[PDB]
JSON list of C-alpha atoms in Angstrom, two decimals:
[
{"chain": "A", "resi": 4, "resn": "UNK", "atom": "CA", "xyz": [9.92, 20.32, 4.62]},
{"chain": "A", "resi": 5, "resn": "UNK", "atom": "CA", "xyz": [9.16, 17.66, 7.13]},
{"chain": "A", "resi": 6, "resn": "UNK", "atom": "CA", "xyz": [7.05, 14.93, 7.99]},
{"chain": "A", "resi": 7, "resn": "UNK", "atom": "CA", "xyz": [3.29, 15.86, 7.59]},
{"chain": "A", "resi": 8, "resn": "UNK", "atom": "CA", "xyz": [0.18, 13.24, 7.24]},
{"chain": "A", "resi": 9, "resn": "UNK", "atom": "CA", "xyz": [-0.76, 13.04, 3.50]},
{"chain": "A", "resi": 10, "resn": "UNK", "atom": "CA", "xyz": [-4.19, 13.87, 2.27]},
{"chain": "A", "resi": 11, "resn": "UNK", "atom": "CA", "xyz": [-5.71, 10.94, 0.18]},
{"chain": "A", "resi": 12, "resn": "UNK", "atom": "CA", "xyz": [-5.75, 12.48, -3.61]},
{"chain": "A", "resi": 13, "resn": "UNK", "atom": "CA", "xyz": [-7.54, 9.51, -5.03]},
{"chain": "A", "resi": 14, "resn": "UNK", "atom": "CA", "xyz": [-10.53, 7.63, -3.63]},
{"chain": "A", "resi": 15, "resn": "UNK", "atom": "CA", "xyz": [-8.69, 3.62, -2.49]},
{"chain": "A", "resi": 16, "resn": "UNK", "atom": "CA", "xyz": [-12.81, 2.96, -2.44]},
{"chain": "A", "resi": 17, "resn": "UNK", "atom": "CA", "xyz": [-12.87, 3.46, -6.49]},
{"chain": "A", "resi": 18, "resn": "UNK", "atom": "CA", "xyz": [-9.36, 1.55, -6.81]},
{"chain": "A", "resi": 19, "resn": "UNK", "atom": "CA", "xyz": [-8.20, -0.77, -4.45]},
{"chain": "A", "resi": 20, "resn": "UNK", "atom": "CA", "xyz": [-10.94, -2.58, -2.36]},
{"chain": "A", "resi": 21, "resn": "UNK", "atom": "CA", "xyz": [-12.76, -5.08, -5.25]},
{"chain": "A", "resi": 22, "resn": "UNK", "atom": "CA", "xyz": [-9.88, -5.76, -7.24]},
{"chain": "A", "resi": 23, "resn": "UNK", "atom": "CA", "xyz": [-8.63, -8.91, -9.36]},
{"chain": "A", "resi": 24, "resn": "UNK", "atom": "CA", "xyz": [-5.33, -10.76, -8.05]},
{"chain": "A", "resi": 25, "resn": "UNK", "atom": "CA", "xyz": [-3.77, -12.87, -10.65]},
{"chain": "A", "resi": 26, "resn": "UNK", "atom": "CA", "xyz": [-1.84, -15.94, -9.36]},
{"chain": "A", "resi": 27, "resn": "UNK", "atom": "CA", "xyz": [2.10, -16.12, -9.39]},
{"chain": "A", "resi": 28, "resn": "UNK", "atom": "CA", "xyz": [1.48, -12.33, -10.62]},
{"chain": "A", "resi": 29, "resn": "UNK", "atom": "CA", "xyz": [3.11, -8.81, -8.96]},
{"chain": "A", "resi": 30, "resn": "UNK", "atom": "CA", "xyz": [0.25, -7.28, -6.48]},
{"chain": "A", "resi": 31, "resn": "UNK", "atom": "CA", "xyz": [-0.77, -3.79, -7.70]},
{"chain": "A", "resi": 32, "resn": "UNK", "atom": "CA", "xyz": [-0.83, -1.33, -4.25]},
{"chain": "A", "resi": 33, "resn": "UNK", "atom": "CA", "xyz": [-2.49, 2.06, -4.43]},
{"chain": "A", "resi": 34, "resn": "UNK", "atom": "CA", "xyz": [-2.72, 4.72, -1.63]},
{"chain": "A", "resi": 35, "resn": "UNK", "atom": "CA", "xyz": [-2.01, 8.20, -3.13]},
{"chain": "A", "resi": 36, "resn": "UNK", "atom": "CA", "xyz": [-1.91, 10.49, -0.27]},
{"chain": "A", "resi": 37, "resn": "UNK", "atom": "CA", "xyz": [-0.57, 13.90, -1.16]},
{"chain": "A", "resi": 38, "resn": "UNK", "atom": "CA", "xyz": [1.45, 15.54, 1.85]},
{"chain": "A", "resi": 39, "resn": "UNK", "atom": "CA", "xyz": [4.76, 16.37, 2.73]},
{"chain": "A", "resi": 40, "resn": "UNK", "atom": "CA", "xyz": [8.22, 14.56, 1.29]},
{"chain": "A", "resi": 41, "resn": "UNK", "atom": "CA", "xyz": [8.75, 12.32, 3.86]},
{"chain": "A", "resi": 42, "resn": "UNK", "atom": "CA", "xyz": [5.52, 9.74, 4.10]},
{"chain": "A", "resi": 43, "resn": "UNK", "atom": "CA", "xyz": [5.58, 6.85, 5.97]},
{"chain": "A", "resi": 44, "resn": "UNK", "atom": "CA", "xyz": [3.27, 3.85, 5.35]},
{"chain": "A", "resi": 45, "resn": "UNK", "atom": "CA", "xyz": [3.17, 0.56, 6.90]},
{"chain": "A", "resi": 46, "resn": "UNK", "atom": "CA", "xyz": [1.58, -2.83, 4.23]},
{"chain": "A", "resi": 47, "resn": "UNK", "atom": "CA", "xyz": [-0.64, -5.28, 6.10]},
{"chain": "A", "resi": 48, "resn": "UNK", "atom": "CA", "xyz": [-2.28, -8.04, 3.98]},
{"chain": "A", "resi": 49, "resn": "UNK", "atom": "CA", "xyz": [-5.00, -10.28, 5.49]},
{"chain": "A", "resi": 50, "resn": "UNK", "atom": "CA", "xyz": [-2.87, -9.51, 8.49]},
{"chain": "A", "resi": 51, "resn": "UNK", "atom": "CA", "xyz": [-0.04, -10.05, 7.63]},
{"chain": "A", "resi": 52, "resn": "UNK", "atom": "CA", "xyz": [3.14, -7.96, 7.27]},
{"chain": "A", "resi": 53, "resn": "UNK", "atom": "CA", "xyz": [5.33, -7.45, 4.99]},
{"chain": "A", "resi": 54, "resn": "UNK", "atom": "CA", "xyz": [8.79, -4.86, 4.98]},
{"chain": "A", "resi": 55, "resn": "UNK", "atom": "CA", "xyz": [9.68, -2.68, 1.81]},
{"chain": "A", "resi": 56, "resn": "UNK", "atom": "CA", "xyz": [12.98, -4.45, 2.57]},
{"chain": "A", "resi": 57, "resn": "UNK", "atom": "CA", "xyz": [12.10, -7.49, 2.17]},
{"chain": "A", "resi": 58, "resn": "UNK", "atom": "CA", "xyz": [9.62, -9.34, -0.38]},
{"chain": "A", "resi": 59, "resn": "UNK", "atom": "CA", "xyz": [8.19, -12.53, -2.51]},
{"chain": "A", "resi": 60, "resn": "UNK", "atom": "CA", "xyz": [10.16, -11.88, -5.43]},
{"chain": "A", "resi": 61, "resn": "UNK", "atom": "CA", "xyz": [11.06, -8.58, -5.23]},
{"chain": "A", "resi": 62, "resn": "UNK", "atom": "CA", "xyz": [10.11, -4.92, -4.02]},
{"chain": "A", "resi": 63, "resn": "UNK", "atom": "CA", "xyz": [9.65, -1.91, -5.92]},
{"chain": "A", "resi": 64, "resn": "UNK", "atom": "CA", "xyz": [8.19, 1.68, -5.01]},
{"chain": "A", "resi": 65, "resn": "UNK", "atom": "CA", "xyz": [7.50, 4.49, -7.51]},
{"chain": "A", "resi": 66, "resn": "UNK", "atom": "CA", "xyz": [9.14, 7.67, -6.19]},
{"chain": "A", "resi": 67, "resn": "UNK", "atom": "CA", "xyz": [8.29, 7.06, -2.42]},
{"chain": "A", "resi": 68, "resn": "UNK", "atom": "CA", "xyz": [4.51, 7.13, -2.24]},
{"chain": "A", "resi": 69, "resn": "UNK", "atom": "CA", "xyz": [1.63, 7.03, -4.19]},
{"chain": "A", "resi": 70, "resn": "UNK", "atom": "CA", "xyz": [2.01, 3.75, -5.79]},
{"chain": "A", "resi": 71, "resn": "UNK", "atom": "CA", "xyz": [3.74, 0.87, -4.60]},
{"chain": "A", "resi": 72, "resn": "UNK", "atom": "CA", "xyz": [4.09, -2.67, -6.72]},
{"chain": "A", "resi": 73, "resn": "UNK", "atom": "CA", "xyz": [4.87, -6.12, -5.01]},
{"chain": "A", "resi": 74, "resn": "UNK", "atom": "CA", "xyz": [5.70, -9.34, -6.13]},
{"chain": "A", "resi": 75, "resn": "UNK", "atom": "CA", "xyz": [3.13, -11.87, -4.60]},
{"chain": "A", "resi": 76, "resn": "UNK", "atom": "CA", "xyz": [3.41, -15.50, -6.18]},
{"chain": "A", "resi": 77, "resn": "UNK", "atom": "CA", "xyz": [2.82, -17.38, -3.04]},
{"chain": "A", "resi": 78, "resn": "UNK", "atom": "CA", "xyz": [0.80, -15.02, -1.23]},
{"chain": "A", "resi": 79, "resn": "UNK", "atom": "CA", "xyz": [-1.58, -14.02, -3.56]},
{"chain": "A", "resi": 80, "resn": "UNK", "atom": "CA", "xyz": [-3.22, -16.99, -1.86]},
{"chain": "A", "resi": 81, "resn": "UNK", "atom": "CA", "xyz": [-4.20, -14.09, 0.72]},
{"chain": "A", "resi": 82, "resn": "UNK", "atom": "CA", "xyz": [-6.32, -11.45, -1.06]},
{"chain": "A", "resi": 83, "resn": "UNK", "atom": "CA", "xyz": [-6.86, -8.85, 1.79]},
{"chain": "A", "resi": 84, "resn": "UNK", "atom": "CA", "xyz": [-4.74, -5.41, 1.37]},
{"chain": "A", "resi": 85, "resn": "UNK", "atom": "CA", "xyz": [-4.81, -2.63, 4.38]},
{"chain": "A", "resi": 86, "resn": "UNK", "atom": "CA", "xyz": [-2.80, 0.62, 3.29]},
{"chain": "A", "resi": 87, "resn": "UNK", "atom": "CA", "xyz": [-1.56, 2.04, 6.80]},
{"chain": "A", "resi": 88, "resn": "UNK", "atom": "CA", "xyz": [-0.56, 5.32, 5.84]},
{"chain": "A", "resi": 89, "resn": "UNK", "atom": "CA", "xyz": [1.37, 7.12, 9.19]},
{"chain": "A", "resi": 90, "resn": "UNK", "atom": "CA", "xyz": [3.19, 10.11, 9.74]},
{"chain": "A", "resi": 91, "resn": "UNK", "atom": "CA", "xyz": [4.42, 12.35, 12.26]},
{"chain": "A", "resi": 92, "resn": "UNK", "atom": "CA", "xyz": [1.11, 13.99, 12.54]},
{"chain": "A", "resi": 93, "resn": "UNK", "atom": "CA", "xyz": [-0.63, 10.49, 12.99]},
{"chain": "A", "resi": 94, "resn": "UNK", "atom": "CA", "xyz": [-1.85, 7.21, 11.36]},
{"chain": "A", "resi": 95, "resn": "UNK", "atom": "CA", "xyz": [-4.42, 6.10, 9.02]},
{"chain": "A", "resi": 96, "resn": "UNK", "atom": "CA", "xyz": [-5.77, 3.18, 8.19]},
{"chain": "A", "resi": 97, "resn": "UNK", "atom": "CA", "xyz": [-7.45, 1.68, 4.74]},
{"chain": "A", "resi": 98, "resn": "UNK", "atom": "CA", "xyz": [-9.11, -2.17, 4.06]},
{"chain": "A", "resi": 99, "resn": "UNK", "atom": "CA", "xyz": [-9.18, -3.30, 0.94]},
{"chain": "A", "resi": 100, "resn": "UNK", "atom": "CA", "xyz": [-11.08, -6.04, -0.55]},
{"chain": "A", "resi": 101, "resn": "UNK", "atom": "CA", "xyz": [-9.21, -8.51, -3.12]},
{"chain": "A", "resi": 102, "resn": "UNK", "atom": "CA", "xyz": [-9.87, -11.72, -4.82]},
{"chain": "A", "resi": 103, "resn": "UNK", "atom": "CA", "xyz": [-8.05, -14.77, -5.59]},
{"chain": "A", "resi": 104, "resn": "UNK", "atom": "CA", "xyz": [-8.30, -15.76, -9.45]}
]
């Protein structure tokens, strides 16, 4: 039980590129990847960066993977969210296409 890339479960295409950002709202993030226990994932939003320790508002992760809520009030202003899934095996990358409402 080690690090080992995660195979996407659930399509980001049907559920994360078109999606609705409400203003001064929490950002939904979805990349379900099933793997091994320990997944690493990196969150880049209209290029920017942005640490699990550190966020607008607040940061909150179910589990460890899967699904991963933050708090965007500010930033919502930028509606572009890439899921960089890596892991010892390698590194992924996913766009996703959001709009400001």
């Amino acid at each position: 039980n080690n690090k080992r890339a995660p195979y996407w479960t659930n399509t980001e295409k049907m559920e994360k590129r078109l999606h609705a950002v409400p203003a001064a709202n929490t950002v939904k993030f979805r990349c379900p990847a099933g793997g091994n226990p320990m997944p690493t994932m990196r969150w880049l939003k209209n290029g920017k960066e942005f640490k699990q320790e550190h966020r607008i508002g607040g940061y909150k992760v179910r589990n460890q993977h899967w699904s991963l809520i933050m708090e965007s009030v500010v930033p919502s202003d930028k509606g572009n969210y890439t899921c960089v899934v890596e892991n010892e095996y390698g590194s992924i990358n996913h766009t996703y296409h959001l709009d400001v409402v």
